[PDB]
Write a protein that binds this ligand. Structure first.
Ligand SMILES: *[C@@H]1O[C@H](CO)[C@@H](O[C@@H]2O[C@H](CO)[C@@H](O[C@@H]3O[C@H](CO[C@H]4O[C@H](CO[C@H]5O[C@H](CO)[C@@H](O)[C@H](O)[C@@H]5O[C@H]5O[C@H](CO)[C@@H](O)[C@H](O)[C@@H]5O)[C@@H](O)[C@H](O[C@H]5O[C@H](CO)[C@@H](O)[C@H](O)[C@@H]5O[C@H]5O[C@H](CO)[C@@H](O)[C@H](O)[C@@H]5O)[C@@H]4O)[C@@H](O)[C@H](O[C@H]4O[C@H](CO)[C@@H](O)[C@H](O)[C@@H]4O[C@H]4O[C@H](CO)[C@@H](O)[C@H](O)[C@@H]4O[C@H]4O[C@H](CO)[C@@H](O)[C@H](O)[C@@H]4O)[C@@H]3O)[C@H](O)[C@H]2NC(C)=O)[C@H](O)[C@H]1NC(C)=O
Ligand SMILES: *[C@@H]1O[C@H](CO)[C@@H](O[C@@H]2O[C@H](CO)[C@@H](O[C@@H]3O[C@H](CO[C@H]4O[C@H](CO[C@H]5O[C@H](CO)[C@@H](O)[C@H](O)[C@@H]5O[C@H]5O[C@H](CO)[C@@H](O)[C@H](O)[C@@H]5O)[C@@H](O)[C@H](O)[C@@H]4O)[C@@H](O)[C@H](O[C@H]4O[C@H](CO)[C@@H](O)[C@H](O)[C@@H]4O[C@H]4O[C@H](CO)[C@@H](O)[C@H](O)[C@@H]4O[C@H]4O[C@H](CO)[C@@H](O)[C@H](O)[C@@H]4O)[C@@H]3O)[C@H](O)[C@H]2NC(C)=O)[C@H](O)[C@H]1NC(C)=O
Ligand SMILES: *[C@@H]1O[C@H](CO[C@H]2O[C@H](CO)[C@@H](O)[C@H](O)[C@@H]2O)[C@@H](O[C@@H]2O[C@H](CO)[C@@H](O)[C@H](O)[C@H]2NC(C)=O)[C@H](O)[C@H]1NC(C)=O
Ligand SMILES: CC(C)[C@H](C)[C@@H](O)[C@H](O)[C@@H](C)[C@H]1CC[C@@H]2[C@@H]3CC(=O)[C@H]4C[C@H](O)CC[C@]4(C)[C@H]3CC[C@]12C
Ligand SMILES: CC(C)[C@H](C)[C@@H](O)[C@H](O)[C@@H](C)[C@H]1CC[C@@H]2[C@@H]3CC(=O)[C@H]4C[C@H](O)CC[C@]4(C)[C@H]3CC[C@]12C
Ligand SMILES: *[C@@H]1O[C@H](CO)[C@@H](O[C@@H]2O[C@H](CO)[C@@H](O)[C@H](O)[C@H]2NC(C)=O)[C@H](O)[C@H]1NC(C)=O
Ligand SMILES: *[C@@H]1O[C@H](CO)[C@@H](O[C@@H]2O[C@H](CO)[C@@H](O)[C@H](O)[C@H]2NC(C)=O)[C@H](O)[C@H]1NC(C)=O
Ligand SMILES: *[C@@H]1O[C@H](CO)[C@@H](O[C@@H]2O[C@H](CO)[C@@H](O)[C@H](O)[C@H]2NC(C)=O)[C@H](O)[C@H]1NC(C)=O
Ligand SMILES: *[C@@H]1O[C@H](CO)[C@@H](O[C@@H]2O[C@H](CO)[C@@H](O)[C@H](O)[C@H]2NC(C)=O)[C@H](O)[C@H]1NC(C)=O
Ligand SMILES: *[C@@H]1O[C@H](CO)[C@@H](O[C@@H]2O[C@H](CO)[C@@H](O)[C@H](O)[C@H]2NC(C)=O)[C@H](O)[C@H]1NC(C)=O
Ligand SMILES: *[C@@H]1O[C@H](CO)[C@@H](O[C@@H]2O[C@H](CO)[C@@H](O)[C@H](O)[C@H]2NC(C)=O)[C@H](O)[C@H]1NC(C)=O
Ligand SMILES: *[C@@H]1O[C@H](CO)[C@@H](O[C@@H]2O[C@H](CO)[C@@H](O)[C@H](O)[C@H]2NC(C)=O)[C@H](O)[C@H]1NC(C)=O
Ligand SMILES: *[C@@H]1O[C@H](CO)[C@@H](O[C@@H]2O[C@H](CO)[C@@H](O)[C@H](O)[C@H]2NC(C)=O)[C@H](O)[C@H]1NC(C)=O
Ligand SMILES: *[C@@H]1O[C@H](CO)[C@@H](O)[C@H](O)[C@H]1NC(C)=O
Ligand SMILES: *[C@@H]1O[C@H](CO)[C@@H](O)[C@H](O)[C@H]1NC(C)=O
Ligand SMILES: *[C@@H]1O[C@H](CO)[C@@H](O)[C@H](O)[C@H]1NC(C)=O
Lengths: 720, 715
């Protein structure tokens, strides 16, 4: 009886239904939520997708439904708990993706039974172990199989693919941990295969399997992020794939030149990713016949020459072009403007000389160019004013060049501008007062390590979308505009190493998402505003997440960097940055910006050092639970160290040196288990150094020049 | 009687014998040689300077003649008198003036034992027709190069040669036709073939060419072959090929990677002068025997110098000028330890001069560093002083600065110091050519050099060409210049030189080009400048690339050394813009006389020279430019100027010259640019030549000139 089976599913499996999705399941079964029936009154499809259901799934309880042909359980928190009751199965579509299944015997069962299965999606689970079983030889209908993003591991069986039914069209094995020699894997007849991906595994080999050439109908072949080695197959090999639209051999270990015979795909090829290998030479001239190519990604290779002009410019339909991290010298080719559909151009980290490309914007058509990225090159001159004509621009990155001169107002007035990134040049001038009023409401304004002068506009408050402001190591003066507190998406504010005066505006406490505040090495006076901690426990993560960054940790003392946006820049260029190459010891962390809290966070990085701030430390500062760096050194702070600082559980760096702090070191600091860099020297501190935690573990230099501190590592208090 | 034939040859054929090559004229006769029998077997009259009319029959009548050597003379073609058989095995009629190709048809029909024949460097005209007779089974060498053959070649021409042929040279003619039409036949024993420097067209090789399995040299240069270089398996047919030249054709596309199939044996490759793009394929790392690689005048780019060429262990000569190679000169190029000649001129190179070749674990063999018309910066590195084998350094048209290290001036074998169009500073050391090499060219014009020209220049007795114009030189011209008897060109314009024009310049036996304009010189015009007139001998300054910019304005433009520089780079130099109207002639230096010449170019304008014009100046018969303008010259214009037969430019303006214009100026047929304005000249304008058609500005500012184009003298 169907009513009974479904009741048995809700009680054994469902452990929590916080949305009451299954409140309708009471007593015909056909009116129940997610349940659909034939006219006979028999269940033929259960759909409980994205239902907030937590439970332990044993498919055998649901498969007992003799007429169940569709089962949708994707987007819940179903764990695994199979019993292998061989209840029999007539499923034709099954989607269990995005759960917490771990026992891969469910796949064995579904492939053994379920001889009418047409599409199965097991992706985005935690299915572990080896792949062993393929759909039963009696299954003659299966077309799509998605096993991607699980924990499959070890070697793929030599005949795993070939054993699949002839009707197979889609097979996705990406995002696992399977290994093996790719040349040993058989695709069998490969009659219907159109989509195949082994991306993001650990698959090796210097040869493709002969069998792969049998897949005459292949349309997307994705073998990226493995360890394939040798040279890319050439000769007549790519003639076997007359329908291929998307190919990726990216992020393997390929070397040599790009075979000219790869152009045999150019009748159909729409997407090509050969990035992240060790390819040398150029894109061969034969690729001029790639009339349908829309996305060409060749970044992170050793390519060189003039192929951007002699080849790429002759590709009419190209929209996305990435050649960063290569060895391409000369000046940016002008013919690149013959590409009238180019939206994204990434030429960062090459050896380009000359001036910035201006031609794209002054073509017979309104320019479609949205992203221009030419960081870490040798471009010189000034930011061309013609860029104003690229009304579609959303992102400009000219960082780490030798650009000079003012920033034309035609940049600040680009309507769609969002990211203005140009740090590590020699740009002069100031920030116009019409920012984000006549130009785009920016998300990022990153102009650190330039020669900018004047005051930060009070119209910076109009940039409500702002996520990241960096103006460090410029020559800005004036006061921090109190209007910064109107920026509620703002997460990172770096103004260190300028000559800013006035107070630290208390309005910075209204910056709801501020997690990184750096005002070091300015001329700020007044008191530490208590409002800087007012968002503690309320901060939400935001869109600053997911950006390339580097962090240079200086290791030369309190007298001897920091966070930088690092899209398209080689780490070598940072080591050789005159500022970085100075301090003897340097460790470069790098990655993508990521939050450590999903909600209810606090500030993460607070550096107010080398100013003239006076007064006492607001007790509220000690409640920033996610704060990792707190540098208040080299100021004129007075009073005591708040006992509330014992609540800085995440703190790693705590610098209070070179102030006029008095009293005792709070014993609750002994409970800071991650504190690895403390400095309280050059104060008026006295009394016992707390015994617990890491406080006894620091070099003597970090307690020096106080008014009678005692206890290890200093001489004992009982002897004085 | 053989003696009777040789005598009938001397008197009937020979018309001049200034060396008395035939004095004793039989086996005792010069060139005549016989067997023990006494039968003529070989007549050798090479390099004899004989003038005559040759009819090979008068010599083939010699029944036993097996060798004939008449190369290096001046024989013309003669009527086909008589008809005898031919027993020749070696025939050499090269470097003569033969015009009738019947001599080839006869040799190909009658000389059936002929092994090697050379008709090269003659004037043989008409179409190629006959191939060596099929009865000839021994002809191994046939050289018909450097003649005047024309029209299409017979399809069967090459294939109709017998099968023992090993060397055929058809180069240096004017033959046309699609290359695919030519049949090579079985091509069993052919090892060297050249069709170079003709007008062959087509986009396919003839299929029969693949039959030449034993080919060691294939030279197809300087034609109109079009398309892409054959790839695939084609070059596998030539497992012995040592030298290949497809240069100066119309090939386009990339260099086939499959051309690397020759790398087991290939020693010489010349693909220059086409429209090739990309780079040398990586597959070429297998070319362990490649000695000479020439890819100049293409459109190549990339780091293949580093990824490929640096891995070629046996290179000695590397030419990549006139390409699109950007970035710094790769340091890995020093891995090429046998590199003798390096030419990277006219690319897009940045960074510093490549000097690493001299710090190898062995003394470098580098003889020629040529990297002109690039964007190099910094200073001439001192590390170049360690390349003790350097003979030629060409760093012109870069952005170099600073002083020229003393280690350069002491390079013992140095001969050509060519670094013009930089911002180099300092001076010429007083120790030039004493501890360093005795130079042939010192070309440093358009720099910022200071000081004086050291008297030590007199030690550079090999000097052919000195250029220091547009510098900041001061002091006097050293009288020691007169010791340079091979000096042909001396350019010192646009400096601040003071003093006299040294009369010792008249001892420069070979001086033909002297430019001292726009200096601060005083004194008199030394008459000795014309003392070599009628005696000048041509010399080794011949055969050098040059450009001449004609301005239509001071010495702006003028003559420059132009090895490895693009004309565009001259058009955009302010050495063009100074005068608004400009035009660029270019070529190779060449004398218009073989002996008994005079000076060719003499510009002394914009100085303060006083006195009268030496009458002797009018006897310079090959002088094409005489500019004495803007000085303080007095006296009259010598009537001897009617002897300046070759003059094109005569500028005598802005002086204080008095008197009449010589009527003999009207006899100067090539005088197209005259200026006599701003003097005290008077009287009629000579009625001859082009003098009545010059603009009024060329006679203005004078004291009573009359006659067309001025108002008539009688009114
Ligand atoms: C193939 O075949 C062919 C034929 O066809 C060939 O070719 C050849 O080659 C050769 C080589 O060797 C050469 O010869 C040489 O040369 C040089 C120069 O060169 C340059 O030039 C030239 C000329 O040009 C002209 O012409 C033409 C035509 O004809 C044209 O095109 C051009 O444009 C020009 O024209 C111009 O001019 C003229 C005159 O004036 C006029 O007319 C007109 O109008 C105009 O203006 C040329 O040709 C050349 O070319 C080359 O190079 C190029 C670049 O590189 C290329 O592209 C090409 O292709 C060619 O190549 C070749 O070479 C190269 C190298 O360079 C190589 O790599 C390759 O492979 C090839 O080979 C040029 O551009 C001259 O210099 C020389 O002379 C020398 O030698 C002689 C003998 O023979 C003598 O007599 C003289 O004197 C000299 O000597 C020297 O050296 C020696 C040793 O070696 C010694 O002993 C002496 O002493 C001397 O020394 C020096 O140094 C020293 C120190 O050590 C001192 O002390 C002294 O003083 C001196 O300085 C020769 O002649 C020819 O030319 C050719 N031809 C043709 C046609 O091309 C080939 O080879 C074949 N191939 C194969 C592979 O086999
Ligand atoms: C072959 O098959 C493979 C899979 O096997 C497939 O590859 C996938 O391609 C995806 C793109 O098509 C890609 O997903 C996007 O990735 C973007 C960033 O990509 C870079 O970084 C990732 C991550 O790099 C990590 O991890 C990799 C591997 O794990 C590692 O190799 C790296 O070194 C690096 O590791 C480091 O960081 C890790 C993470 O912290 C850390 O764990 C490590 O320790 C280490 O430190 C790489 O994969 C890439 O190579 C790149 O380098 C990302 O930006 C993007 O997000 C956007 O899209 C998502 C959904 O599409 C949205 O959720 C998200 O919000 C973003 O949305 C933006 O764009 C959409 C439009 O698409 C727009 O609607 C949004 O509004 C937003 O717009 C933005 O711009 C507009 C202005 O235009 C603004 O207004 C907005 O505010 C926004 O700024 C994607 O998530 C995926 O990573 C990649 N997977 C792998 C494994 O490579 C490949 O495509 C197949 N190939 C073919 C040819 O078919
Ligand atoms: C901003 O602050 C800078 C930095 O000076 C800091 O140290 C000096 C001690 O020399 C101290 O007087 C000042 O309050 C800061 O803490 C000032 O520049 C400094 O000016 C002093 C004047 O006595 C000079 O001695 C210093 O050499 C000089 N620079 C440095 C690096 O020490 C600057 O004048 C201050 N004001 C403004 C508007 O920028
Ligand atoms: C903007 C935000 C999202 C950033 C980019 C976030 O992703 C990063 O993870 C930020 C939070 C961290 C990157 C590493 C950097 C340093 C690296 C280092 O030297 C450590 C020394 C010692 O051990 C104490 C802890 C230190 C200071 C940590 C503190 C956290 C960091 C700033
Ligand atoms: C060093 C020597 C061997 C040189 C390089 C030799 O080769 C060249 O041929 C020299 C002699 C001649 C090249 C052309 C040049 C110019 C070209 C020109 O514009 C002419 C204008 C007028 O119509 C008549 C005279 C002019 C000035 C002639 C005079 C002869 C030249 C200098
Ligand atoms: C199997 O289901 C998964 C999960 O629903 C699909 O992956 C999702 O694809 C959509 C396409 O719009 C993305 O928006 C989601 O982010 C993906 N889920 C992730 C990344 O967890 C997958 O496409 C399905 N299989 C097939 C073959 O389509
Ligand atoms: C600002 O300009 C200076 C001067 O151009 C840059 O520093 C010089 O960079 C060149 C080229 O790399 C080096 O040759 C010099 O040695 C550098 N130092 C000097 C001239 O003192 C500097 O990098 C530029 N700054 C930024 C951030 O790009
Ligand atoms: C965690 O944060 C949430 C919001 O992100 C807090 O819940 C509410 O927050 C709003 C302000 O956004 C307050 O007005 C409400 O009173 C809060 N609701 C409550 C407490 O039920 C929540 O307080 C935070 N929890 C902490 C800091 O422990
Ligand atoms: C080749 O020898 C023949 C035969 O002696 C020469 O022909 C005679 O030349 C003389 C002198 O010009 C004439 O008078 C005769 O009429 C020619 N014919 C005879 C003798 O039959 C011929 O001149 C010789 N060739 C050369 C180049 O000297
Ligand atoms: C080479 O021989 C030819 C004749 O074969 C000579 O040419 C003639 O030379 C005279 C001067 O002696 C001129 O008057 C004639 O006009 C020339 N004739 C032709 C047809 O050019 C030439 O002089 C000889 N050259 C030498 C011996 O160097
Ligand atoms: C001497 O140096 C100057 C300055 O570098 C050169 O002239 C400059 O060249 C640069 C690079 O092409 C141009 O951007 C400048 O506009 C030029 N003119 C200046 C700075 O006034 C000059 O060419 C050098 N000398 C020679 C002979 O080439
Ligand atoms: C052509 O030049 C030659 C060689 O210079 C001159 O003839 C000889 O000149 C030398 C001196 O170099 C004298 O010793 C000889 O006596 C001269 N021989 C003669 C004149 O036969 C010759 O005078 C010059 N011819 C001219 C200028 O017409
Ligand atoms: C002589 O040399 C000068 C100096 O180079 C050339 O022209 C000058 O070029 C410099 C470039 O630094 C300028 O400062 C001067 O204004 C230029 N013009 C003049 C008239 O001095 C000059 O062209 C050279 N002479 C000729 C005839 O070309
Ligand atoms: C698709 O699958 C069917 C059934 O297995 C097979 O016969 C056919 O050849 C395959 N290909 C196409 C293009 O239909
Ligand atoms: C020419 O080639 C043929 C065939 O290889 C051979 O018999 C003959 O000896 C060759 N002749 C010479 C002179 O090498
Ligand atoms: C130059 O020679 C050294 C020594 O053999 C070698 O290791 C290096 O890779 C060579 N460089 C190149 C670019 O081949």
């Amino acid at each position: 009886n169907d009513t009974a089976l479904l009741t048995a599913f809700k009680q054994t499996s469902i452990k929590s239904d916080p949305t009451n999705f299954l409140g309708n399941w009471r007593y015909d079964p056909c009116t129940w939520r997610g349940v659909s029936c034939s006219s006979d009154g028999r269940v033929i499809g259960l759909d409980l997708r994205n239902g907030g259901l937590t439970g332990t799934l044993n498919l055998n309880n649901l498969t007992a439904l003799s007429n169940l042909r569709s089962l949708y359980l994707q987007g819940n928190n179903f764990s695994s708990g199979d019993s292998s009751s061989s209840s029999g199965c007539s499923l034709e579509v099954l989607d269990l993706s995005s759960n917490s299944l771990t026992d891969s015997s469910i796949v064995d069962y579904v492939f053994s039974t379920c001889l009418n299965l047409v599409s199965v999606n097991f992706s985005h689970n935690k299915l572990a172990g080896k792949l062993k079983s393929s759909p039963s030889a009696s299954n003659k209908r299966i077309t799509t199989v998605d096993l991607s993003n699980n924990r499959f591991s070890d070697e793929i069986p030599e005949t795993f693919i070939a054993d699949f039914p002839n009707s197979l069209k889609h097979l996705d094995l990406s995002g696992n941990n399977v290994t093996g020699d790719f040349s040993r894997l058989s695709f069998g007849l490969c009659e219907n295969l159109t989509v195949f991906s082994l991306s993001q595994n650990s698959i090796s080999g210097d040869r493709f399997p002969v069998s792969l050439s049998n897949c005459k109908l292949l349309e997307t072949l994705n073998l990226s992020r493995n360890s394939l080695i040798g040279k890319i197959p050439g000769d007549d090999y790519w003639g076997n794939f007359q329908n291929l639209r998307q190919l990726s051999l990216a992020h393997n270990l390929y070397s040599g030149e790009i075979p000219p015979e790869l152009s045999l795909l150019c009748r159909t090829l729409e997407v090509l990713d050969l990035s992240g290998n060790s390819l040398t030479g150029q894109l061969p001239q034969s690729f001029t016949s790639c009339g349908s190519l829309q996305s060409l990604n060749l970044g992170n290779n050793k390519l060189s020459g003039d192929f951007l002009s002699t080849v790429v410019s002759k590709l009419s339909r190209i929209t996305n072009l990435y050649l960063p991290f290569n060895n391409i010298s000369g000046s940016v080719p002008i013919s690149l403007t013959n590409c009238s559909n180019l939206r994204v151009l990434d030429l960062s980290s090459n050896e380009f000389t000359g001036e910035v490309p201006s031609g794209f914007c002054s073509l017979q058509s309104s320019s479609v160019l949205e992203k221009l990225l030419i960081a870490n090159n040798y471009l010189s001159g000034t930011v061309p004013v013609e860029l104003g004509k690229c009304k579609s621009l959303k992102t400009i990155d000219l960082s780490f060049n030798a650009l000079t001169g003012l920033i034309p107002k035609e940049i600040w007035t680009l309507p769609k501008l969002s990211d203005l990134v140009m740090w590590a040049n020699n740009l002069t001038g100031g920030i116009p007062e019409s920012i984000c009023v006549d130009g785009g409401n920016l998300e990022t304004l990153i102009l650190n390590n330039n020669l900018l002068t004047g005051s930060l506009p009070e119209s910076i408050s109009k940039c409500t979308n702002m996520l990241w402001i960096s103006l460090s190591s410029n020559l800005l003066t004036g006061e921090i505009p109190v209007g910064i507190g109107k920026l509620e998406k703002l997460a990172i504010l770096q103004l260190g190493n300028n000559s800013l005066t006035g107070n630290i505006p208390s309005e910075l406490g209204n910056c709801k998402n501020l997690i990184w505040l750096d005002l070091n090495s300015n001329n700020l006076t007044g008191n530490l505003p208590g409002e800087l901690a007012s968002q503690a426990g309320l901060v939400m993560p935001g869109s600053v997440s997911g950006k390339q960054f580097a962090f240079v940790r200086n290791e030369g003392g309190t007298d001897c960097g920091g966070l930088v946006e690092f899209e398209g820049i080689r780490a070598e260029r940072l080591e050789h940055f005159p500022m970085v190459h100075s301090c003897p010891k340097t460790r470069i962390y790098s990655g993508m910006t990521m939050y450590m809290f999903s909600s209810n966070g606090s500030m993460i990085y607070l550096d107010l050092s080398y100013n003239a701030v006076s007064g006492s430390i607001p007790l509220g500062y000690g409640a920033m639970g996610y704060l990792q760096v707190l540098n208040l050194g080299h100021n004129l702070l007075t009073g005591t160290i708040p006992d509330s600082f014992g609540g800085l559980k995440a703190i790693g760096v705590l610098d209070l040196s070179h102030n006029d702090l008095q009293g005792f070191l709070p014993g609750s600091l002994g409970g800071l288990s991650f504190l690895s860099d403390l400095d309280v020297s050059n104060n008026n501190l006295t009394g016992p150094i707390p015994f617990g935690g890491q406080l006894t573990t620091f070099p003597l230099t970090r307690y020096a020049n106080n008014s009678g501190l005692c206890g290890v590592p200093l001489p004992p208090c009982s002897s004085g």
